[PDB]
Amino acid sequence: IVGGYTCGANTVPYQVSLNSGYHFCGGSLINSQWVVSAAHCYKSGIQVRLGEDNINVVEGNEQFISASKSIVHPSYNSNTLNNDIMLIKLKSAASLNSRVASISLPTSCASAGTQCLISGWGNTKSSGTSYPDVLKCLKAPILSDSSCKSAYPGQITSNMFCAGYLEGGKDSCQGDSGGPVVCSGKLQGIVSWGSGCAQKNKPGVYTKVCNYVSWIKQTIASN
Numbered sequence: 001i002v003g004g005y006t007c008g009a010n011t012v013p014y015q016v017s018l019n020s021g022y023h024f025c026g027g028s029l030i031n032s033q034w035v036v037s038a039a040h041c042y043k044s045g046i047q048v049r050l051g052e053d054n055i056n057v058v059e060g061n062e063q064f065i066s067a068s069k070s071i072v073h074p075s076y077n078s079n080t081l082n083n084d085i086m087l088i089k090l091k092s093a094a095s096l097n098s099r100v101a102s103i104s105l106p107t108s109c110a111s112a113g114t115q116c117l118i119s120g121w122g123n124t125k126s127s128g129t130s131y132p133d134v135l136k137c138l139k140a141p142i143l144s145d146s147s148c149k150s151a152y153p154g155q156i157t158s159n160m161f162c163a164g165y166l167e168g169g170k171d172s173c174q175g176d177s178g179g180p181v182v183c184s185g186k187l188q189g190i191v192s193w194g195s196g197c198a199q200k201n202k203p204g205v206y207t208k209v210c211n212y213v214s215w216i217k218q219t220i221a222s223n
């Protein structure tokens with residue numbers, strides 16, 4: 001997260017860290033046994049870390065749970081990042097509490113201008129690298145269809161939306177991938193891609209979760 005702020009410990013209680021001996025992606029808890037992340041975050045040996053603030057210190061309230069299933073959208077395309085979504089099942093259910101909580105799936109798609117909360121342990125710099133220990137937050141609006149396609153012509157599918165700031169300075173970045181875009185209490189986006197981070201005229205691109213609610217429910221019920 002570039003140009004954001006320290007969230008505060010466990011202020012984003014649905015935010016998880018995906019760990020493979022290091023933090024490599026984010027995700028969102030949607031029930032005590034399932035996490036929503038990005039398909040480009042797939043790998044084997046995923047450990048899900050819930051209740052995190054400082055990812056480099058055991059502070060209390062952490063739950064480490066291995067993934068027992070990682071389900072990439074069958075129609076995920078790694079070149080276009082269309083359908084950049086993955087469902088991860090926990091080997092055991094998480095213990096739900098004020099610091100470890102699920103986030104609601106949306107009832108409807110959000111509209112342009114809608115202000116959202118984007119969070120992660122990703123890169124905090126626009127050029128060069130700096131990774132934080134504690135969770136970072138960014139408030140960002142969803143942008144219009146037209147501006148999004150203007151910014152990335154021929155690359156925006158009906159499963160992507162843009163959010164952020166055309167003026168540069170504030171964005172998600174590498175490491176934030178798979179993390180939440182939450183708007184009005186609902187999971188509307190997944191950190192997916194963009195050109196660089198926080199560059200002018202290149203806003204973040206996010207998986208449009210409202211298009212997958214049925215998929216998510218049908219898949220979970222079947223697994």
Ligand SMILES: N=C(N)c1ccc(CNC(=O)[C@@H]2CCCN2C(=O)CNC2CCCCCC2)cc1
Nearest residue numbers: 079080081155171172173192193194196197204
């Ligand atoms: N807000 C940001 N600027 C932001 C930027 C990058 C990321 C992490 N995601 C990525 O780095 C992804 C994963 C594989 C290559 N990524 C890309 O960003 C590449 N995107 C492509 C090529 C452009 C035309 C269609 C889209 C596919 C996350 C956030």
Ligand SMILES: [Ca+2]
Nearest residue numbers: 054057058059
């Ligand atoms: Ca910790």
